[PDB]
Amino acid sequence: IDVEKLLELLIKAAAAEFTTYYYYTILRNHATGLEGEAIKEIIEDARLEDRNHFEALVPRIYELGGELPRDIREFADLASCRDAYLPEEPTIENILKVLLEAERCAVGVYTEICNYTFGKDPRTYDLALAILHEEIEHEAWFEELLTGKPSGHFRRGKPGESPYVSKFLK
Amino acid sequence: IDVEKLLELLIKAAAAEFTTYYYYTILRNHATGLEGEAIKEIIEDARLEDRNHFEALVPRIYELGGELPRDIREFADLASCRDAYLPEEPTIENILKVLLEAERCAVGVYTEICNYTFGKDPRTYDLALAILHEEIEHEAWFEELLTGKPSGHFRRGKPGESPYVSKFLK
Amino acid sequence: IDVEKLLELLIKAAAAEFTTYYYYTILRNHATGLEGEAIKEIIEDARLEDRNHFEALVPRIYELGGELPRDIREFADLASCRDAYLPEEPTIENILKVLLEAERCAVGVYTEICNYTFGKDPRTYDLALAILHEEIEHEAWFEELLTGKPSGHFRRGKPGESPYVSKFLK
Amino acid sequence: IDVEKLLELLIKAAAAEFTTYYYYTILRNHATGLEGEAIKEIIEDARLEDRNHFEALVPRIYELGGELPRDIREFADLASCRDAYLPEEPTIENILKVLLEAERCAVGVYTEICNYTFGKDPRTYDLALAILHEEIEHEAWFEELLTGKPSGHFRRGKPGESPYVSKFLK
Amino acid sequence: IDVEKLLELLIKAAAAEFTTYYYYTILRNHATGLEGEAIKEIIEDARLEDRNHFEALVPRIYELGGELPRDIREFADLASCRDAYLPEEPTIENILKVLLEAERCAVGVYTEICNYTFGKDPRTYDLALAILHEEIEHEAWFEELLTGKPSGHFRRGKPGESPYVSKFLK
Amino acid sequence: IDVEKLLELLIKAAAAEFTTYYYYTILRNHATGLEGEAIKEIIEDARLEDRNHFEALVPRIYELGGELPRDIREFADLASCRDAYLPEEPTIENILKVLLEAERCAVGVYTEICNYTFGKDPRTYDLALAILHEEIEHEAWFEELLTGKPSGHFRRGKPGESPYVSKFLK
Amino acid sequence: IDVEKLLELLIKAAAAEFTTYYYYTILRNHATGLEGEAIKEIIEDARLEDRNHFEALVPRIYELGGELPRDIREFADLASCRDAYLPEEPTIENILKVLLEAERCAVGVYTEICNYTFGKDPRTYDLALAILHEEIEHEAWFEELLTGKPSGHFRRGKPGESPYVSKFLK
Amino acid sequence: IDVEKLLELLIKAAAAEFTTYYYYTILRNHATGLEGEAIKEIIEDARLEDRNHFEALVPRIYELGGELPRDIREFADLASCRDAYLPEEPTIENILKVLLEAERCAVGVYTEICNYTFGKDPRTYDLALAILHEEIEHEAWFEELLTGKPSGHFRRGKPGESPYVSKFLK
Amino acid sequence: IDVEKLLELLIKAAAAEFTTYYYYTILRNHATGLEGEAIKEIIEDARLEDRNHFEALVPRIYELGGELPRDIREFADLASCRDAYLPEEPTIENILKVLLEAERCAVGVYTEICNYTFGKDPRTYDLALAILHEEIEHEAWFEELLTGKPSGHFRRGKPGESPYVSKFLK
Amino acid sequence: IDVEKLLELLIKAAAAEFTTYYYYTILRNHATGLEGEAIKEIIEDARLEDRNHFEALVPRIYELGGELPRDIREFADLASCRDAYLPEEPTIENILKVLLEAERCAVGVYTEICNYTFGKDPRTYDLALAILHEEIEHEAWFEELLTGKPSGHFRRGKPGESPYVSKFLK
Amino acid sequence: IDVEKLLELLIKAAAAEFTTYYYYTILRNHATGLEGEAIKEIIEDARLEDRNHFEALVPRIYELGGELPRDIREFADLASCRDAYLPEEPTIENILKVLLEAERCAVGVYTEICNYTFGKDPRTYDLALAILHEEIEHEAWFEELLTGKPSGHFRRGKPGESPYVSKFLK
Amino acid sequence: IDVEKLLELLIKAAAAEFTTYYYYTILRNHATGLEGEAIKEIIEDARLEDRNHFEALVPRIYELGGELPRDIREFADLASCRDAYLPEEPTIENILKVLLEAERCAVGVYTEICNYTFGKDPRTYDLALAILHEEIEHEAWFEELLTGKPSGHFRRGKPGESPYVSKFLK
Ligand SMILES: [Fe+3]
Ligand SMILES: [Fe+3]
Ligand SMILES: [Fe+3]
Ligand SMILES: [Fe+3]
Ligand SMILES: [Fe+3]
Ligand SMILES: [Fe+3]
Ligand SMILES: [Fe+3]
Ligand SMILES: [Fe+3]
C-alpha cells in the first residue's frame, strides 16, 4: 500500500467533512417553513456526524505521518466533494438535491478508501467503514425525503450521536 | 368467569399485538417523503408499544394456565384484528387509514376483555386496562393525523416507553 | 427607579405568561393533521417555557414587596398581551399568526422591563433579560414557520427546558 | 354513560386544578416565619401536583370530544371548588384551613367522577382514581398539620413528582 | 362499607407482610448448596417486596383512622397468614412448600380485600390490587420452582423493585 | 473470644433493630402538627437506618454459625433495648424522650460489642463500629431536638442512606 | 455481487430472527423447575438479542431496495432455520437441544452472508458479522449447558443488550 | 476604571465570604431545638453558597493581577462585613438577626461592585451580579424567617447548589 | 444601533471561531513530547469551546437577518483574527505564543461587540459577554503557561464544556 | 513494627491475589453445565474482587518503601497461597474444594497482617481489614455451596464491586 | 480518656485543615508555567480534601461537647501545623517543599489522635483514621513529585472526592 | 485455517497482555517527579486497556477449543513480547523506550493475527482488529512522548475505557 496516496485520500476526505460542516449549517438554516421543519433535524444530524467524521479522520492522518495543510483555504480546496452550496432557488426540494448529491459523493469517497485499504491497512479500513456506515444512512435519509423510495430509517435519537464512528472519538 | 374463554381472548389479543409488530414495520418504512417524515416516529412508537403489549400479555396467559400455540402460523391466524396490510396505493392517507382501523380494533379488543373481567379477575382487568390506555392514545394519534379532530396528544418522549404497561414489563 | 411602576410591569408580565399557559394549551390541541404535527412540539415548548416564566417572575414580585392579585380573574385581566384566542378559522396558518403576535407582544414586554431597569435594578434586569432570550427564540420559531424567513433555530431538546431562565427556577 | 355530562365534570375539575395552581402560589408565599417554613414545601408539592392534574385532564377532555372554554375567565368560573383565597387574617392556621377545605372539595370531585365512570369508562375512571390518590394524600397532609390526627404521611421526595398521575403525563 | 372491618383486614395483612419479612430472611439463609443458589435471589425479591407491602399498607391504615397495635407481639399475632417457619427438614423442596403456602395465603388475603372494597373504596382497592399483582407473581415463581408448571416469569431485575406497589412508596 | 456470647449479643442487637423498625413507624405517625413536621423526617431516617442495621447484622450472625430464632415473638423478646412504645401522652416532647432513650440504649449496645471484639474479631468490630457511628448520630439528633444542646448535625440527604453501614449492605 | 440473491439471504435471515423471537418465548416459559431456573435468563438474553437482530436487518433490507413480504405467514415460511418447536418431551435437556440446533443454524446463516459479502458489500458484511458475534456466543452458551464443554461465557449483564449489534440499533 | 480600587473591593468581598463560611458553621450548630430544625438547612445552604462565592472570586482577583494576602489573619481582617459572631444570647431570633445583618451587608458589597464596574468591566460585573443574585435570595430567606414579610422563596433543592454562580465554578 | 455593522462584526467573529477550530487542531497535534503533554488538553479545551462559539454565533446572525457567506473561502477570509498558523519553528514556546496572540485578538473582538451593543441589543450583548468570559479564561491559561504570571485557572473538567456559552447551545 | 517483615507479608499477599486472578479465570471457565451455571457468577465476583485486592495492595507496598519484584515469575513464586490449580477431575464439587481452600488461605493471610499491624500501622491494618471482609464473604459463599452450611450471603449485585475495598481503589 | 484533651487535639486539627484550605489556594495559584501545570491539579485535590476534613471534624467536635472558638482569628491561631506560606522564592520546588512539610505535619497530627483514641473512642479513632488515609496519600504525592521516590499514586479522578472521609460527609 | 496454530497465537498474545498488566504497574510507579507526572496517567490507560485485552482474548481462546496453561509460570513464558522490565537506569526516557518497544511488539502481534485470520475467521479477525486499534494508539502515544513526532492523540477520558474492545467485554 502507498501511504502517500492513502494520506491524500484521507486528507481530501477530511476536507470534505470539514467544509460540509460549514455548508450544512447554511442549508439547515434555509430549510424553513412547515415543510422545512421536517428536515431541519435530519440536516442537523448529518451536519454533526460529518463534524465527527472530521474529528475521527485527523488522528489517523497524523498516525500515518501526514498532516493537515498549513492554511485553511488550502484545506478547503482539497475537498473530495464539490461544495454543497445553497441553491439559487432554495426550495426544500432543491436543498434536498444538494444534500443527496453531497452524501452520494461521500459514499463514493469512503467506498474508494475501503477498496484501497481492504486487507492491507486494517485500522484505516475500519475507520473508513465506520464513516461509510453513517454516509450510507445519510444518503438513505435524503433519498427517501426526495424521491419517496423507502430507506428504512427514521429520526436519530439525538443529532450527532455517530453510533458507528463513536469508538474513534474522544 | 370462564378461564378457557378468557384465555382465548388473551391469546387472540397477543396474536394481534405480535402481527402488528411485523405489519407496522412495513407501514413505517413506506411512510416516506416530507409528509411521511411527520408520522414515521408516531408509527414507530405505536409499533414498539404493541411489542410491549405482546410481552405483557404472555406472562398472564401462562399464569392462567394457557400457552402460546405450537406454530407461529397458528398464532398469527388467531389475531383478533385483521392484518394491517400495506395498502395497494400506499399514500400517507391510505396508510393512516390502515393504522386507524387497526387501533380501533385494538381498542375494541381490550374493551371486551375489560368488560369480561370487570370485578372478577382484577389482575387481568388491570392488564387489559393498561393496554387499553395505550390503544386509546394510539387511536387518538392517528385519528387526528387523518381527520384533523383534536386528540390532545403530541409526540411521545421516546418510542416504546409504554407509560401505562411498563409496570407489567421486565 | 419607581418600584410601584416596576411591580405593575412585572405583575402584568406574569399575568401574560399565566394566561398564555392556558391559551397555548388550546392552540396546541388544534394544531392537527399532518401539517399540525410539525408545530405541535414547538407550541408545547413555548407553552412550558411560558409557564416557567410565570414561575420565575413570582418570586421577584414578592422580593420587591408586591403580591399577586387576590382573584385569578383580576390577575388574567392584567395581562400585558391580549388573549391568544383560538382563531375562528383554526387553520395552521391562522394559529401561527396568533402565536407570532403573542410572542411579539412578549418580546415588547420584556424589552420594556429591561429598558426600565437597565443599570438600576440588576437582578430584575437579569430576570427580564433571561425571559427575553426565550421570547426572542419563540418569536423566531413562529416567524420562520409562518413566513419562511430563516430564524436559525430548530427543535429544542425537551419541551420546557428554559435554558436561559433555569437559574431562576427551583 | 352521558359523555356530555362527563365532559362537564372533567372540565370543571380541570378548572379547579388550574385555579388552585394560581391560588396555592399565593398561599405558599404567605406561609411565612418559623412555623410557615414547615408547611411551605408541603403547599408547594400540592401546588405542583395540582398543575400535573390539569395537564393530565386536558388530553382526556379532548379524547372524549370536549374542549377547553375559549376564554380563561370562563374557564376559571367553571371551577368545581370555590377559590382558595388568601384569608383576611393570613395566619398559618387560617391558611391550613383554606388548604384543607380545597383538598376536601377535590376529593369529593374525583370521587364523584369515579362513581360516575365505574365500570363504564375505564380510562377516565383510572385517570380520576389516579388524581384521587394524590388528593387523598394532600387532604391527609393538611388535616394532620391542622388537627394533629395521624395521617401516615411525611415529606414527598421532590415537589410535584405525582407518583400516581405520572403515567398520564408527557 | 364498614371501615372498622376494613381496618382489621388491612392490619392483619400488614402483620402478615411484616412477619414474612422476618421469616423469609431465615428461609433465604437456609436455601443452601448448588440447588439453593437458584432460589436464593427469588426468595430475596419476595422478601423485599413484602417489606414494601408493609410500608405501603401502613399509611392507608392511618389514613382510614386506624393504628398499628401498641406491642410488636400483638401485631405479629394478628397476621392473616400462619408463620412461614423453617421446616424441620429444611430441604429446598420443603422450603419451597412453605414459600408457596405463604404466597397462596397472601393471594387470598388481598383477593378478599379487593372483593370487600370493589366499587366502594377506590384508593384501598387500588392498593390491595397493587399488592395482589406482586403476590400472584410470587406464587407463580414458587409454584413453577416446586411443580414445574410454567408460570411465565423469570428473574426480577433487582430484588425489591415492586413495580406495581412503587407508586404507593416514598 | 467466646463466639456463643458474641452471637447472643449480636442477635439481641438485631432484635432491637428489628423491633425499632416497627415502633419508630408508630412514633413517626404520631409526630403530628406544625412542630411534628420538623422531626418526622428525622424519625424516618433513624427508622430506615435501623432497618439497615438489622439487614447488616443478620449475615454476620450466620457467618459466625448462629441463626435467628424460629419464632418472631422469641426474636422480639430478645431485644437488648426496651420497646420504644408510644407514650401515653404522645406530645412531641414525650416522643422525643422515647427516641432519645432508645438511641442511648443502642449506643450502649454497640459500644459493648465493640469492646468485646476489639482486637479479636476485626470483621465484627468493624460492623459494630459502623452501626455505632449511625447510632451516635441518631442520639445527637434527638438530644439536640429535645434539650437544645448543639449536636453538629442537620438533615440527612435522603432517609435511610446509612453512609457508614452501606458497605455491609447488598 | 447479486443484490437479489443477497436480499433473499437477508430476508430469510430476518424471518429466522423474527420466528425465533416467538419460539424462544415458548421455550423460556417451559424451562421450569430448579434446573430450568438456571437457563431461563440465558434463553431470555438470546431471545431479546434475536429480536434486536430482526430490528437491525430490516433497515439494511430496505436500504438495498428489498422489502418484507406482504403477509406475516409468507415471512415466517421464509425462515432460514427450521422452527424451534417445543419438544414433545420438554425436558431441560431436550429444550437445550432445540436451542443449540437453532443457534448452530444461525451461525451458519450469517457465516454464509459474511462469505457472500466479504470485500464486496462492506456495510452488509459488517452487519452480518455483528450478528454472527452474538450467534457464536449464543451457541457457546447452550453448548456448554448441554455438553459441559467450556465456552468461556457467563451471564450477560442485562438480557438483550446486544453489545455487537447495538451500533445498528435505534 | 481603577483596577487597584477594584481589586481591594474584590479581596474585601472574598474575605467576607471566607469568614462567613466559618461563622455560619458556628451559627448553624447553635440553631437547635424544634424551631432551630427549621432554619438549620437554610443556614447550611447560605454557608455553602458563600463558600462558592469565595471560590468564584479568587480566580477573578488573580486574573486582574491581584493576590490574596500572605497571612490568613490579614485576610480575615479585610472582610467588608463585620464578623457574624454567635450572639451572647443565642436564641433562634438573635441568630436570625445576625444572619440577616450579614446578608444585608453582602447585598451592599456586591451592589457597590456592580455599580463600580457597570459598563466598564463586563466579566467582573457579571461575577458580582451572579453573587448578588444569591445574596438577595439569602437576605429574603432570613428576613421572612425573622419578620414574616413574604420573600417568595422556599427550600433550595440541595444546599450549596449556587444556581447563579455555578458557571464561574470549576 | 446599525444592524448591518453589527452583523459584519458577528460574521467576522464567527469566521475567527471557525478557522480557529481548524488551526488549533494543527497546533494541538504539534504540542508533542513531555512538555507538550501538559498543554495538549488545554489547547483541546480552547479548540472545542471556540467551536461552541461558532455554533452560538450563527443563530444570532440569522436572527438579526444576516447570513453566512456562500463560499467557505469567503468566510475564512472574513476572520477578525489572523490565522493561527503553526510556527516555522514549532517549539512549545512558539506554539504558546501563537495561541496567546489568537486569544488576545478574540478578547478584543468580543470586547468591541460588547461595547457596540451595551444597552442597545441585550441579547447580542449577553452572547458576546458569554463568549468573552471564555476567551478571557483562554487568554489567562496561555499567558500563565508562557510567562508564569498567575492566572487563577487550572484544568477544565472536560474539554469543550463551555460553562458560560452553554445556555446558547442546543 | 518491622517494615521489612510487613513488606514481605504484603508482597506475598499481592502475589496470591495476582495469581488467583489468573487461576480463577480457568476455574470459572470449567464450571460448566447446569450446575456450573449457578456458581460461574460467584467465581467471577471472587476473581474480580481479588484483582481489586492486588490493585489496592500495590500502592501501600510502594508507600512503605517496597517494590514489586522485577520478574513476574519471581512474583508468582512469592504467593502466600498455593496455586488454585484446576483439579485433575474438574467436577463442580472438586472445583469448589479448590476455591474454598484458596479463600481459607486468603482469610488466614489477611488475619495475620491485621494481627501484625493492629495498633501499630493504622493505614495498613485498615487495608488488610478491608480485604479480609471480602475474603470472609468469599469463603462463606463457597463453603455454603460445598457443604450446605448457611453463610448468610447471596449474589453480589455486579461482579467485582468490592464494597469494602473500593475506598482504596482509583 | 480525657475528653477535654481530645477536644483540644480535634479543634487544633480542624484549625490546621481550615487554614490549609486558604493557604493551598495561594500555593495552587503560584504553581505556574509548564512544570506548574503538572502539580496544579494535585494541589487542588489536596486543598479540597482538607476542606472536607474540616467539614468532617466539626460535627465530632460538637458531638463531644466542644465548640469552635468565637473568633476566626483565635481559630487560625490554634492550628496544629504552621502556616503553609507561599515561599519567598516561589519556585515549583520551594512550593512542593511547603506542601510536603504541611502534609507531614498533618500525618503526625492524626497519628497522634489515633494513638490517643485507640481502643477508647471508636468513632473518633475511625474519623482520625479516615483523615490519616488521605493525609498519607497527600504526603506520598508531594514526596514523589519532590524527591522521585515512588509513592504508588497517580491522579485522583476528580479533586476533592475524599474516598476515605466521604462516609463522614453530608 | 489451522485452529491449533491460531490458538497458539492467541494464547501467546494473551500471555503478553497479562504480563504487561504486571510490568506496566511497575513502570507507572517509577514514572516519578514533575516529568513523570505527565506520563503516569498515559501508562495507566495503557495498562488497564491491556488488562481488558487479556479479558477479551480468553473467551475467544475457549470458544475455539483452547485453554489457558495450567500454571501461571508456563503462561508467562508464552508471552509473544519480551518482558517490559524496569530499566537499570529508570529515567523517564528509558521507561518510555521500554513502553514504546512493548507497544510496537503488540502492534506486530495483532497485525500477524489479523493477517492470519483475514477472510477466514471473522470473529477472531474482528477481535484482533479491535485490540490492534488500541495498540496502535498506545504506540502513537509513547512515540510522541519519546520522539516528538505528532501522533494525533491526547489524554483518554478515563483510563481503561477501551473504546474499541468494549463490545467484547462483559
Ligand atoms: Fe461525513
Ligand atoms: Fe414567556
Ligand atoms: Fe388536584
Ligand atoms: Fe440501629
Ligand atoms: Fe439472531
Ligand atoms: Fe456570599
Ligand atoms: Fe472563541
Ligand atoms: Fe487534611
Coordinates of N, CA, C and O and ligand atoms in Angstrom, one line a residue, chain H residues 16-17 20 46 49-51 53-54 103 106 110 131 134-135 138, ligand 6:
Chain H
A16 N -14.9 38.5 53.3 CA -16.2 38.4 53.9 C -16.8 37.0 53.6 O -17.4 36.4 54.5
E17 N -16.7 36.5 52.4 CA -17.2 35.2 52.1 C -16.5 34.1 52.8 O -17.1 33.2 53.4
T20 N -17.4 34.3 56.6 CA -18.8 33.8 56.7 C -18.9 32.3 56.7 O -19.6 31.7 57.5
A46 N -26.9 28.8 52.8 CA -26.2 30.1 52.7 C -24.7 29.9 53.0 O -23.9 30.5 52.2
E49 N -23.1 28.3 49.8 CA -23.1 29.2 48.7 C -22.1 30.3 48.9 O -21.4 30.7 48.0
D50 N -21.9 30.8 50.2 CA -20.8 31.7 50.5 C -19.4 31.2 50.3 O -18.5 31.9 49.9
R51 N -19.3 29.9 50.6 CA -18.0 29.2 50.2 C -17.8 29.2 48.7 O -16.7 29.5 48.2
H53 N -18.9 31.4 46.7 CA -18.6 32.8 46.3 C -17.2 33.1 46.5 O -16.6 33.8 45.6
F54 N -16.6 32.6 47.6 CA -15.1 32.7 47.7 C -14.4 32.1 46.6 O -13.5 32.6 46.0
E103 N -26.2 39.2 55.6 CA -26.7 39.1 54.3 C -26.9 40.5 53.7 O -26.7 40.8 52.5
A106 N -23.7 41.9 52.7 CA -23.3 41.3 51.5 C -24.0 41.9 50.3 O -23.3 42.2 49.3
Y110 N -21.9 43.7 47.0 CA -21.9 43.4 45.6 C -22.7 44.4 44.8 O -22.3 44.6 43.6
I131 N -23.2 36.7 42.2 CA -23.2 36.6 43.6 C -24.3 37.4 44.2 O -25.0 37.0 45.2
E134 N -27.6 35.6 44.6 CA -27.7 34.7 45.7 C -27.7 35.4 47.0 O -28.5 34.9 47.9
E135 N -27.1 36.5 47.2 CA -27.2 37.3 48.4 C -28.6 37.8 48.6 O -29.1 37.8 49.7
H138 N -30.6 35.0 49.8 CA -30.3 34.8 51.2 C -31.0 35.8 52.1 O -31.6 35.5 53.1
Ligands
FE6 FE -21.7 35.3 49.7

